Every structure is written in C-alpha cells, then in structure tokens.
Design a protein around this ligand. Structure first.
Ligand SMILES: Cc1ncc(COP(=O)(O)O)c(CN[C@H](CCC(=O)O)C(=O)O)c1O
Ligand SMILES: Cc1ncc(COP(=O)(O)O)c(CN[C@H](CCC(=O)O)C(=O)O)c1O
Ligand SMILES: [Ca+2]
Ligand SMILES: [Cl-]
Ligand SMILES: [Cl-]
Ligand SMILES: [Cl-]
Ligand SMILES: [Cl-]
Ligand SMILES: [Cl-]
Ligand SMILES: [Cl-]
Ligand SMILES: [Cl-]
Ligand SMILES: [Cl-]
Ligand SMILES: [Cl-]
Ligand SMILES: [Cl-]
Lengths: 325, 325
C-alpha cells in the first residue's frame, strides 16, 4: 500500500539516464529485428505484401523489462506459441534463439524499462488460394521504451472509465480473444467513445450484460474483499495472472468467472491491468466516483505486490548489459 | 447465357501479352505508391510503426480494371471516403488527384486486367494517448494482376461452400462490416474450416440463424425467380450493387433483407460476388448438390450482365496506356 514513490522514482532516474543517451545511441529510442537485421525502430520497414498488414493475419505478444529485468518472459513466449498454434502459425525460430535475440536487442538498446513486442505473421502469401506447404510465416521483433496505458501521475489518483454503449467486444466465436491479436476495430471504437464521453478508458461488454476487457487491459473489480475478473471473452493476461499470484500470497480470494455489468456500479474498487503500465486504478466510472473516488486498499496491496514480483527470481531475471558478453 | 468463353479467352490473350513484358517492364508484376514514390510491388515497404500494421487501424477499398477499363472507380472512391469518415480518418489526397495517380499507375504497369487497392491508415501515431491534432493519416496504393477468389475454370463448374459452424461473422456492434477492413480473423477461420470440411468457400452466419457474407465476397441466393441477399452484417459490395443493376434491367426482383440460413438449403441457385473474381457460382453446399448441382439460369444471366457492364460507359472508362486516360 506504499511502493509507488520508490517504483516511480527509480523509473524516473533510469529514464533520465536513457534520455541523456539519445544523441549517442541510435537504439535508445528503440530497436527492431527485421529479416535477421537489427535497425533503429523508427527506420524499421516491412514488406507491404506481408499478410500481417494485408489481412492482419498474425498474432503477437508483449513481454517487458523493468529495472533491467525481463518479467515473465517464458510465460509470454509460451502464450505466443499457443496463439500461433491456434492460428496454424509457427514461431519461425526456436524459442531459445528468440530469447537470445531479445536479450541481445535489449542490451544493445541500453533500455532498462522496456516494452518488447514479437509478431508472427502468415508471411508473404495469404491463406486463400495458396498451397499450405508454400506458406512461410514471418517474424518481427522490437524493443522500445516502456509504454504507459496509464501514466505514473494518473496511477496515483486513478483514472476515468466508461462502460461502452456504442460498441461491444468481438465475441470468441468470431475472433478468439485468448489469441493475442492486432485486430482492434472494437477497441479503437471504445477509445473514441470514452473520449467523446469525457473519459479515458473503455470497458467493453460481451453484448450480453457481462464485462470483458478494454483497449489493451484486463478489468478487475473489488467487492467485499474479493476480486472479480471476467473468465470468458478476454485475453488471459500475464498481468492478470500476476494479480492472482499476489492475491493468493495475500490470502485474497479471486473469482475468475462471469462478471455482470451491474457489479461495476456497486463494487468497492476497480483497477485495470496490463503489461503496458501494470496496475492501473479506476476511480471514476461513467462520470461518478467509485466508492468515494480514492484508490482502494486492496488495489494498493496488489499494486505493491505486482511490482515486488519484478525482483523475484521465480518471475524475472537480470539482463547483462555489459559489452560484451 | 454464355459469355464465359469470350470473357476468359480475352483475359488469357491479354495475360500472354502481359507476361511477355515482364523482362522489360519492372512494373508488369505490380506497382505500389508509397510516400509519393512509385516502386515495383514486390519491393514495396511500409514503416513497421504504421498503425495500419500495429493495430490494423485502417480502411481500404479495391476497384478493378478489366480489358483496360476502370470499373466503377467513382463508387469505390466514394465508399473509401465513407469508410474513412466512419473511422475518423481522412483520405490524405484530394480524390481527383488519387484517381489521376491510380490511372497513371495502371498505365505504367501495362496491366489490362488489374486488382487495384487503396489503404488509408491512422498513421505513425496511434489513437491511444495521442493528441487528435497530432494524428496524420497515411495512404498506400497498389496495382497488381487481377485476383480471382474463384479461378475462371472453377467458375465454369461451380464451387463448393459450407455454412460455417466453428466461426461466425464479427457483429456490427463490434466492428462495422460496412467499413471495408482487413481485420479478417473470422474470415480466415472460415477458410480453414471450409478446407477442413473438404470445401472451398465459407458462408458465415450472424450467430443468430441468418446469413451474412464470406471470406472476401457477398452471398446471393436464388429462389423461385427472386434474388435474396443479406442486408445487415455485410459489406455493401459494389459487385452486389452491379448484380442489383443487372437484375433490375432484366426484370428480376432482388430482396436485400434478412436471409435465414434455412433458405440456403432450399434455394434454386447460389452465387458469390466480389470485385476479385466477379460472379462465382456455388453448386454444392455442405456436401449436397444445390438443386441438382448445375450452374443455374439466373446465375448465368447475371454473370453475362455483370461482365457487359464493364464495357458500359455508365459504369466504366477506358485507360490510355502509355499516355494516361
Ligand atoms: C485486449 C487486451 N487484453 C488484455 C491485455 C493485458 O494482457 P497482459 O497482462 O498479458 O499484457 C492486453 C495487453 N495490451 C497491451 C498493448 C496496448 C497498447 O500498447 O496500446 C500490452 O501488450 O501490454 C490487451 O491488449
Ligand atoms: C468481407 C467482404 N465482403 C464482400 C466483398 C465484396 O464486395 P465488392 O463487390 O465491393 O468487392 C468483399 C471483397 N473483398 C475482396 C478480397 C480480395 C482477396 O481476398 O484477395 C476485395 O478486396 O476485392 C469482402 O472482402
Ligand atoms: Ca535490477
Ligand atoms: Cl533504479
Ligand atoms: Cl492460449
Ligand atoms: Cl451509458
Ligand atoms: Cl479479438
Ligand atoms: Cl535466462
Ligand atoms: Cl482482349
Ligand atoms: Cl472492392
Ligand atoms: Cl457503391
Ligand atoms: Cl454443419
Ligand atoms: Cl469486419
């Protein structure tokens, strides 16, 4: 219930070092792997005919680095492989080589707090009209400075959400939300709706009176000392997984189940969770304060627990930035 | 009711001529417009950070050229602008300039039968966390040899379809299907399902016992001299529009309305329609011959009518090759 000052101050200090190197290190603003070559992220290009662009025929995943430590990298690569399997894709390199490249990329960038993305696409030939044996999947990877879906200043007070009414989440029988994907048509609609309504974060329903997820995050409700989070219709987030780990360590019950929309209007606390920002409190919903409008005690406990895990060998490992090896 | 021989023979003759130019015209296999530069299609590259790739945050449209005549180009540009408006995008160049560039591209390629695609993306900055004033949309365009969703020799016989059971169409309240888009998660699932079931084409339902569309085409049923095609849940196809034009000219009623799945099992004829292939008969459905399994008389009449429209000044214009239209 009190790690924010230190977590954010550490980040600010590391950030200041990174920023100072932007004119000397061409990778300080990010680095990409394309067709076996490493290039500054702003200069990275992909073939126009890649079906990842032509029909968003891809999956992706986003591990992260915090304070020079990769967080749950194996979980993210395993989820990527699972997503590939569901799409009949195959990770184009052995996963141990992939890990080695990522660590090399991070080390070269000098970035201590990083957003790391891997993308596997169908390749230069589409599914339609192609012999399955002629299909060759493509891999793209990049590392960039850590991305905040909720900035540190706002995490201190909580953000503003709406339950979206002009859009609902793509259902699993159309697109499987457990397959991480970049088909964000509904999520972008949600972001526009939130903004139109004077808020920031959209919570999308399943179009059947139950909650799913938002534009880049899972949703957790807190009521009478219990956490509630949607089971079906959502990405099985690694942050959400970490929230469950922390809750279990603290003796807090977590129910991963169908969550009726009505619970969002009568719960004690709300937070979002995602790799790109961590634990993100929501203190206004549909223009109304959430139970008084302050960040709640269980949210604070989970917040602290989540960041503590980033230093636990069971969930993280230290990257060697030395040059080299 | 028999224009197939002449239409396909003409195409074959033009294909042979096109092929003979490939060793001397670097654009004969296709040409792309990227950031104001014209490049061979295979060499075209886009920024990795373009949000058209990063979150498929884009719309697109696909006019075509047949026998050196652009087909309904104005309709396609108008639909593109409509799609852009619905996504809060804006065509980055005046539409008259866009048409001029397209004609120039086709002429340089020397392609007489062409698939032409325009893509408008959100640009290098995403909706999330960006000042709306800081967003600059991007334009990509390319011309390639005509693409067949059903090959000419399969159109002579008819194709096999299934009503998909493992996937349904993304509903409009999640992603608006009247906005042409490349978020094909459900459509690719449909293609895999069709293949798994020994058929070529998937027909997707609305997940509520009514038909919508398939993987790159609209669906038309013929029953007792009347055409039926889904109103809601689908792209408002320009080919479908052309089918309606031809049918009205022929005195054939067309009902654009809710089409129950059951009608597909008791109708007299079925065909698919799309810019990438035209009029595409379906003669087996779920492994069962459609009303005897032969291409039907109304399908043939529409087939002929559709291709005749490609030479009709009301619907087309001739491109001036080596001099621009
Ligand atoms: C739809 C969706 N649901 C849930 C999550 C949370 O899952 P995890 O805890 O495994 O991260 C994400 C993460 N999406 C953000 C990217 C969003 C952006 O950059 O705008 C991420 O990959 O972290 C997401 O995109
Ligand atoms: C989902 C969908 N519905 C209907 C249609 C028919 O609409 P129109 O008659 O306006 O073309 C298309 C055409 N999409 C094809 C896909 C091409 C491909 O798969 O390679 C196109 O863009 O021409 C489509 O993609
Ligand atoms: Ca450390
Ligand atoms: Cl530190
Ligand atoms: Cl999974
Ligand atoms: Cl509301
Ligand atoms: Cl999805
Ligand atoms: Cl290791
Ligand atoms: Cl000819
Ligand atoms: Cl089209
Ligand atoms: Cl139109
Ligand atoms: Cl079935
Ligand atoms: Cl769609």
């Amino acid at each position: 219930m009190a790690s924010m000052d230190k977590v954010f101050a550490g980040y600010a200090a590391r950030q200041a070092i990174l920023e100072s190197t932007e004119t000397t290190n061409p990778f300080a603003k990010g680095i990409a792997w394309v067709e076996g070559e490493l290039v500054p992220l702003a200069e990275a290009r992909i073939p126009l005919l890649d079906q990842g662009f032509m029909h968003s025929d891809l999956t992706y995943d986003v591990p992260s680095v915090w304070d020079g430590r990769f967080f749950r990298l194996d979980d993210h690569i395993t989820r990527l492989e699972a997503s590939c399997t569901k799409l009949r894709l195959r990770l184009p390199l052995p996963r141990d080589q992939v890990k080695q490249i990522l660590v090399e990329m991070v080390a070269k960038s000098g970035i201590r707090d990083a957003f790391v993305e891997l993308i596997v696409t169908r390749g230069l030939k589409g599914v339609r009209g192609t012999r399955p044996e002629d299909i060759v999947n493509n891999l793209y990877m990049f590392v960039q400075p850590y991305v905040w879906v909720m900035e540190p200043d706002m995490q201190r007070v909580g953000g503003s959400a709406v339950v979206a009414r002009t859009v609902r989440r793509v259902p699993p029988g159309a697109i499987d939300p457990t397959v991480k994907n970049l088909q964000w048509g509904d999520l972008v609609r949600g972001m526009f709706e939130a903004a139109d309504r004077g808020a920031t974060y959209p919570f999308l329903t399943d179009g059947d009176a139950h909650l799913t997820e938002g534009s880049g995050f899972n949703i957790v409700l807190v009521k009478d000392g219990v956490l509630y989070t949607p089971d079906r219709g959502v990405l099985q987030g690694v942050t959400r997984k970490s929230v469950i780990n922390a809750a279990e360590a603290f003796g807090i019950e977590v129910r991963v189940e169908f969550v009726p929309v009505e619970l969002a209007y009568r719960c004690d606390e709300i937070f979002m969770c995602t790799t790109a920002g961590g634990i993100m409190p929501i203190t206004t919903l549909d223009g109304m304060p959430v139970n008084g409008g302050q960040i709640g005690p269980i949210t604070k406990k989970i917040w602290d627990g989540y960041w503590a895990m980033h230093y636990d060998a069971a969930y993280s490992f230290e990257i060697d930035y030395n040059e080299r090896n």
